[PDB]
Design an enzyme around this catalytic site. Structure first.
Site, PDB file in Angstrom:
ATOM      1  N   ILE A 161       8.987   2.379   9.935  1.00 23.07           N
ATOM      2  CA  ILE A 161       9.288   3.395   8.854  1.00 23.07           C
ATOM      3  C   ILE A 161       8.149   4.664   9.048  1.00 23.07           C
ATOM      4  CG2 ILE A 161       9.969   4.451   6.820  1.00 23.07           C
ATOM      5  CD1 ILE A 161      11.266   1.675   6.147  1.00 23.07           C
ATOM      6  N   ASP A 197      -7.505   1.178   4.917  1.00 28.27           N
ATOM      7  CA  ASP A 197      -7.136   0.163   4.432  1.00 28.27           C
ATOM      8  C   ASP A 197      -6.770   0.517   2.750  1.00 28.27           C
ATOM      9  OD1 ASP A 197      -6.678  -2.247   3.493  1.00 28.27           O
ATOM     10  OD2 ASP A 197      -8.843  -3.268   3.919  1.00 28.27           O
ATOM     11  N   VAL A 198      -5.511   0.449   2.572  1.00 32.29           N
ATOM     12  CA  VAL A 198      -4.995   0.734   1.126  1.00 32.29           C
ATOM     13  C   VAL A 198      -5.360  -0.084   0.124  1.00 32.29           C
ATOM     14  CG1 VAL A 198      -3.150   2.433   2.053  1.00 32.29           C
ATOM     15  CG2 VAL A 198      -2.630  -0.031   1.535  1.00 32.29           C
ATOM     16  N   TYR A 234       7.562  -8.135  -4.990  1.00 28.95           N
ATOM     17  CA  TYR A 234       7.777  -6.927  -4.433  1.00 28.95           C
ATOM     18  C   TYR A 234       8.802  -5.843  -5.171  1.00 28.95           C
ATOM     19  CZ  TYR A 234       9.769  -3.745  -0.594  1.00 28.95           C
ATOM     20  OH  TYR A 234      10.121  -2.666   0.085  1.00 28.95           O
ATOM     21  N   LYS A 293       7.472  -2.013  -6.296  1.00 22.39           N
ATOM     22  CA  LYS A 293       8.269  -0.777  -5.798  1.00 22.39           C
ATOM     23  C   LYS A 293       8.847   0.063  -7.293  1.00 22.39           C
ATOM     24  CE  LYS A 293       7.666  -0.598  -1.384  1.00 22.39           C
ATOM     25  NZ  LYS A 293       6.914   0.474  -0.625  1.00 22.39           N
TER      26      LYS A 293
END
Ligand SMILES: [Mg+2]
Ligand SMILES: [Mg+2]
Lengths: 257, 257, 257, 257
Positions: free
Chosen positions: A22, A67-68, A162, A166
């Site tokens: 994406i 690197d998040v 997850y 989100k």
């Protein structure tokens, strides 16, 4: 007037997780709209390769390692873009992982924390670093890659971390939208359905998963990355001038049923 | 028949953050409905005082030390209850913190991570530990204290981590609701407006904050802890047999405008 | 204190569509909580049989003929109750129909208009007539029977007018909640899943429909009328004092997926 | 590739309420993207003026009289376009009215019913007539002009029928999205904030109204018609290929608080 609003000529965009899937589609869309795009990604090799392919098509594309999960990495990566480009006009935050088929009663702390750290804490680190620059410009736009998982619960695959991460991303983005609206900044998120990517293809090749996904989708298909990227590019442009704090559903009707 | 569905006689309830404010109101409502209630809280002295008060009222209440930032602490406390009481029928998860009036550009990693850890990671720790027992029993109910902050963004006080963490809690609870529905478990959340407690004193005594809160509320008031406790008790009871994965707005109409 | 909040002793309740199914369950629950209840229904014989049955159980109940497509009928019926009982404390608005298995491209004006007139226009007629009295009292509570169909789109049966009408009902009730909040009135709606009733039992005996409904429900079942009535009774009571403009999901998790 | 997705060259669009304000802006945006556009509006002289102005710019624009309260009018207007153009690719449904500052306890049946008839019943009339053609084509896109009023309740102005009607529009459009997704049709709605128009000018000049609207808006401003048109044009285009059943917030952050 109307078609011109869609252009991003000379605007500097950072795309986290931009080296593939994406993210790479978003990079391509922004670049096609005229933007100067920097791929910010953990994989130095992937990013560099992607940069070559895009320059090959005549795009003004560069790369930085980020690197998040690491505040220092994010801040160093953002500062050096600011240094070289002079401005940051756009952030598209795609960095994320999905740890799936892991039951709520089984998930380990490590699995939970990793999921939340990359998806949600990483969103904080990214948006804060870029946001500080946009605040001084009194101009900027953020698009986050959320998920329909922030609104509904996927089936049959279990992935509560997850889904929670989100939802956190959506409401975090909305908080930024509210706080930063009077300062020339917009922030929105897209919430896609299943997108065919190198990673989701493992789910797609498992009939128990894929058949449920298709059966639960009015359009009877998964999406492709270019379909998410088109929405992201729109939200990054002046055509979207009245949109802030929107969770934009891009889900082939999945959330309608 | 309808009125009897509201009773919780002999049912074992753990209330995290149960020693004061909304938690303590929930403990009281549960006990008045007939539940055997365990206050699970960080503050041993505050919990013991609450137990003494409630026991003098004729209620069956006890306490256990629990630090929701620590998995071992949560697991040990929940096991202790299970060992001493024989069952865990109900969890009400109230433990949470709010670090507010901190602008999104200014919030430290420490402030962000602490809020996510107590509010969201703590929800995972508490729901998994209790959930495992409920799954074994093929029976149980969870009620989380969410927040209207999970759906709208408070003003004027900045608290993006709080807002994100509570959206995370809502969608986590919904994920548990979906995963555990076939196993005799229900999980819902309440999303309250401002409630008068020790934790909202700083806003209620500051006119810039309080006046904005009231002006934003159709009922023109903040809520009281007992008004949240009433909904929590209802959701914990068989009267709510058809409700799972619901985010129940308890907000004096704040989200209506 | 907590259990006492659930009581409705000597309060006057009108239940539109109260002669059968969800309406009748609401009538029963309210009566068991101590309310004087008036069944307001188009079918006089059916209402009369219901009244006689409940009266045998010791309840204080009566009925009035009311056609929610007709403003004079609604106004006269409400005036009659107000004169006969002295007050109107509660309105539960259940009157509605569902024209289903009618494709959007096929539905006639007559079919569309009848559905909107009963479900949505009839909601305005009922709420305005009772609301005027509640405003004079500076006290009242409305509970509408909405539907999950206001939020999601049922499958496989087509019913776009029903879905639209129920979303209209939800937002109309929220509008009333906002306008009337300063004047001691609360207004909320329930949004149920499939409920086993005389009407839905046809769909339940059709595997193409029933199997899809069950497969789409996390609890893997339809609801029973008493499970909706429990939530309605709660929302009508002082226990729900902080709730107004809430669309309360009572759907066995259907809207979670 | 990405920029070409935004083009509408030679596609036929009907815009109801297209002669002024948002409708006219939508007409202009579609035409600038290359569409063949027909203004469908109540009054012939008003639509003719707009046609003349747009033809002076070289745009392929025409008009037809359509009264959305009248099925025969709608069917005849749609048939006329089909006979003159050979196809209908896009419907943008803007026809609507807002009767405001009318309290719920005061609103007449005539006021309620007219608002429902134009905004909601007229949506059904318009969408069915065009939808039938799109189903034959196995190709089509609908964009409805919804409203943030479908989701939140405006203040201080009372307009419960408007709010209800727009919620009805949202869920009707979502129902069409679900029913028609397998047949190559997409259907979405935009939900705008206050937009400066010839009709909203009067409210904007009333400080009691305008000041509240501004104070409720993170961006601190009303929108302009072109800002809504840009989103409508995007949604009508292949760039929005993955979007159906979306209620897209275009509200300057209004629904975020
Ligand atoms: Mg669903
Ligand atoms: Mg609001």
């Amino acid at each position: 007037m109307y078609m011109e609003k869609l252009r991003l000529d000379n605007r500097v965009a950072i795309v986290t997780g931009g080296a593939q899937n994406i993210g790479l589609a978003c990079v391509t869309a922004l670049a096609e709209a005229g933007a100067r795009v920097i791929i910010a990604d953990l994989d130095e090799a992937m990013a560099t390769k992607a940069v070559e392919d895009l320059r090959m098509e005549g795009h003004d594309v560069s790369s930085v390692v980020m690197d998040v999960t690491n505040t220092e990495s994010v801040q160093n990566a953002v500062r050096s873009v600011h240094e070289q480009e002079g401005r940051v006009d756009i952030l598209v935050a795609c960095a994320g992982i999905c740890i799936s088929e892991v039951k709520a009663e089984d998930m380990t702390d490590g699995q939970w924390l990793k999921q939340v750290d990359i998806n949600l804490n990483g969103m904080f680190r990214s948006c804060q670093a870029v946001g500080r620059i946009m605040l001084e410009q009194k101009q900027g736009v953020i698009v986050a890659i959320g998920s329909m998982s922030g609104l509904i619960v996927n089936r049959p695959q279990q992935q509560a971390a997850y889904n929670a991460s989100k939802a956190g991303v959506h409401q975090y983005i909305r908080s930024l939208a509210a706080e930063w609206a009077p300062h020339g900044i917009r922030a929105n998120a897209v919430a896609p359905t299943y997108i065919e990517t190198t990673l989701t293809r493992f789910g797609m090749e498992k009939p128990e998963l894929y058949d449920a996904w298709i059966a639960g989708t009015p359009m009877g298909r998964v999406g492709q990355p270019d379909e998410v990227a088109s929405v992201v590019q729109f939200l990054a442009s002046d055509a979207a001038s009245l949109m802030t704090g929107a969770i934009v559903n891009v889900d082939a009707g999945f959330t309608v049923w």
